[PDB]
Structures are given as C-alpha cells and as structure tokens.
Symmetry: C3
Subunit: 212 residues, 3 copies
C-alpha cells in the first residue's frame, strides 16, 4: 500500500508541475556498473547473478521515495515498498514473460520468494503468467546475449508513468574491471539527474558490499 505525498510542501513542487504538464518528458541514462567485487562475492556463494542483481536493484529502489511514485486519483502517491517485475526467457519458443515476486530486505527470504515463482511459472509462455502486474512495481529486464553501451525505450505515451525502468546487458571485461551495462529510464516529473545518479551510485555501493 501507499501514502499520499505532501506536494504542497515539497522542494520540487514547481518541477513536478513543470515536467508533468508544461514540458512532459523523461530521460534514460546508461552507465557501467563495476561488478568485479560482486562476481567475487557470487563465486563464493550459491546465489545466481540475475536474482542477486534483481535484489540489489530492488533494494536501492526501496530506499528512495522518488523511485516509488505513482498517480492515484490524480494525486501523487509513494508506494511503501515495490516488488520487482523481471523478464524471463523461454528458449523453446524464443519468447519472454514478465514475473514478479515479493521484495524482502533479507536476501535469503528474497531468494526463496524468487526461486518459488520461477519453479511455478518459468515454463509458462503467457506474457503475464501471474495475471495483473502488482501496482507497486519496478521493471527489470536483461539482454544477456549482447553487450550494449546505450539502451533507450521510445514509448508513444508515457503520461504519468513514474516507475523506473531498468535494463541490463551482457557484462564484459574492460581492462581491469568487469563492467555491467545498466540503463535507467525515468520520468522527469519525479526524478532529476541527481536522483538517478544517487540510485546508480547506491547500487554500485551495494554491488561492492557483502551480500549477507
């Protein structure tokens, strides 16, 4: 569930109106995450790369209100917590589906939740096997077959859609660092450059930290 944001006392109330109504826009930015440390943490564990990245991304998002915003009854709200909606691939059809699972700050509980959803739905070729996407969501996708330096979604109508869209590519070694490309796409009504940078820098810190 959610709270109504106090727009009238917000430092960004002018910006919110401006980028929602006067100059509606968002932006994407693609950055490399250094996963050198994370790969060492992983290689010494039983967790898999994609669910760990999902967990760390969702953890970072759940720290920052402006990454959990939405419009409900034409008012700005903030979800208390958001769950990741992530894509999965079906090699037999060469199609993908979107699944979600409950976020938990505990990585072991997260992994339980994830592996359970995968067990039930990993072969289901419906686009949305679980039915309606949780309203409190953040979108995560990977393209593990190719490296990219840039990714951008051209959406014909993004009116009042404020959930961040995160896309990863195939990681690759670049000199002395193992680098994961990560695109983050937001609506400027709720996120400026500073908030996106804060998110990325926090995710980088999480990748460089003990997993638990």
């Amino acid at each position: 569930n959610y709270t109504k944001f106090d727009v009238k006392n917000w430092v960004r109330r002018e910006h919110f109106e401006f980028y929602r109504h006067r100059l509606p826009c968002g932006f994407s930015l693609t950055s490399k995450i250094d996963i050198t440390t994370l790969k060492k943490s992983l290689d010494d564990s039983a967790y898999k790369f994609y669910p760990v990245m999902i967990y760390l991304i969702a953890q970072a998002v759940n720290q920052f209100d402006e990454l959990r915003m939405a419009i409900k009854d034409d008012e700005l709200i903030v979800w208390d917590s958001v769950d990741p909606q992530f894509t999965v691939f079906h090699q037999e059809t060469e199609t993908f589906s979107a699944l979600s699972c409950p976020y938990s700050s505990d990585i072991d509980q997260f992994m339980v939740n994830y592996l359970s959803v995968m067990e039930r739905y990993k072969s289901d070729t419906k686009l949305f096997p679980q039915g309606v996407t949780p309203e409190n969501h953040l979108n995560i996708s990977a393209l593990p077959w190719v490296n990219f330096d840039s990714f951008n979604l051209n959406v014909a109508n993004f009116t009042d859609y404020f959930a961040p869209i995160i896309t990863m590519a195939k990681y690759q070694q670049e000199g002395d660092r193992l680098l994961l490309p990560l695109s983050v796409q937001v609506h400027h009504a709720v996120c400026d450059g500073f908030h996106v940078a804060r998110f990325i820098n926090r995710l980088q810190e999480l990748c460089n930290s003990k997993l638990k």
Copy 2:
C-alpha cells in the same frame, strides 16, 4: 517486392504483438560495438569499400530474420520475402546527404554491381530521394563517420506501425587490440524483442568476421 501475410494466430509472439502494437506501443534502441578488426584486415585485399560492404553485411543479417522484414500492409502483418537497403550518401560540395537504395543480393559481387550502378546514376543528385519514393521493402542504414559515439537514439514523433529496423554507425576507433565500430539498432517492440536485436547484432558480428570470398 513480394510479401506473404503472416500467420499471427499461430505465432508464438501473438500476445506480445497485440500488447506492443496496441496496449503499450513502444520501440527501443541500443548501441553496441562491433569488432571490425578482422573485417578491416579482409578489406585491405578487397576491390570493395568499407561502407558498401557494411551495407551488404547489415542487409544480409536483416534478410536472415523474418521479424526484421515485417510491415503492416492493408492493416495486416506481412513479411517481405527480401528487403533492400536504403542508405545515406554524403555530398561534400553542399554538406548535405541523400538516401539511395539498391537491390539486395546474397552474392556480394552482384550486390556491388547493383550498388555501383545506383551510385553512378545518382551519387551527385542532391535531392533527398533521387530515385523517388523509398521501396516498400526497405531497411534504413546511415553512417556518421565524422565522430565516434557510444549512443545514438532517434526520437520519432509518430512511429505507429513502422517496423523496419533503423541502423546507424559511428566513426570506428581502436580500443586495446580491437578496431570497434559503434552501431545503433532501433526497432519496434511489436515485432522485435531484446532477443531478436541481440541475435541480429551477433549474426552481424559473425558476418564481419567472415571471408569476403
């Protein structure tokens, strides 16, 4: 060219097609670096030039995959049997470009005959479309050889039902022991997922690493 009506009812992506055509219309771009170390070395011995060879290889990779030859015709999904490249050419005298097309052939020598013929007839014409209207069965290829980029994205005001891939290359540059060509690929999500764009780029990489004859 010739086309066939696609069987959407029996398509594994039937649901995705409706979703990304009607519910959430969108496409995406991505920019990837192609390793052209082997190609540049191959081209050192070739009668043919870098840009027309890249056009040929891009067109060959596109022609391999049905989802990169899709269109709406008469408000139904079709697949072109084959698509022809429409490429941009620069005019040094005016600092303007034109778009030319030529018939695709899987045989590089025949392609280059076709390419040279179009260039001979039209290369000095400063009209945007010297040949008249773009053939319906087309891909778009452009080069920006004057600057290296890591990103390129087209912001198109109305891309409704436009499914032909748009390919843009930057100035190549050396990165450690490889020569890398930045290549941007922009598609519509109704017909192409990340898998299909990745498959295209990786196939193109294979073709760049292939013998020219």
Copy 3:
C-alpha cells in the same frame, strides 16, 4: 536579440527541412566522449571553474554555426545572431536545481564576469526560473556531475519546432592517460544532420585543446 529571416528557398537543405519538420518529424541524441586532458591542465593555472568554462566553450562552438541557432518565429525559420546559455544550477541544501542564463561573450573574461554576477544574484533562489522567462535566443546546458554515463537521451512528449540544441555533460572519468567527459547532444533533424552534430563536437574538442587565454 537580433535575428535574420532565413532564406529556406535557396537553402541546400530546403528539402531536408521540410521532410524532418513535417513528413517525418524527428530528432536524435548522440553521446560522445570529449578528451579534457589538456583542458584540465589549462584550468590548473586559472581562477575559472570547470563548469562555467565548459558552458563558455559549448556556447562558443554553438555560436559559430547557424544551424545550432535556429528557431521558428512569426511562423518562419530564423537564425539568432547569437545565443545565450541557459544552464542548470544545483542547490545542495534542497537537492533541487534552477535554470539561469547570462549573456554570451566571445571574451572568456567578460563571460566569467557575466556568470559570476548571475550566480551572486540568484544562486540561493529555489525557483526553477529565478530570472523570469528563458531568453528567446538560448542554448540549454546541463551537468550531471554525480555519475558517469555513456548514454543520455531525453524522451520529450512534444518537441514540435523546438530547434535549440540540448547539451548534457556527465561525470568525467580517467581512462588510461586520457580524462574523458561524456557529452550528449540532442537536436531536431529539421535543422541538424549527423554532419552538423559531428562538426559541433569536433569543434568543441578543438576548443578544449586550445589556450583559454
């Protein structure tokens, strides 16, 4: 300021202007790295700070090229004699930004006078546009100094007839013995092709590598 009414009928891009304004309305972004190794050394013997110097050099390069100073005014294409930078200013206390403008000068010292004056008058003002309406003859410049990026693109719902370039710079980063500044340039294709954007980036690179004094 002063502007001229552009002769579209005798323009070499008459047909491109029509095409990308009306037939296929679009623009593009592209992100490139600027080598600021020389500039950074230049600034180690200067009182001038990195951000205003970059504003100056970007504005200087834009002011050299007519196609980066275009607009629609009284429903016709015009060229501004000169454009002034509108730049984003960050307020650390609130973690919000404002947009400020100051007059462009070809003299770096006068430009810095102009910049420091506006900062003194308005740096504590949290309004988005403290000075009032953006000057009609403007260029937009933003910094995003907190994170390095290789791509940046603005997804603008309606960009009809907006021809002023949008320039965005990231956190600079050391790569070997080069210090690289990511720079995104986003234009309308009606007034700028790949050639002009490349020409702008390369000119900026040349200015960064030149004496400031």
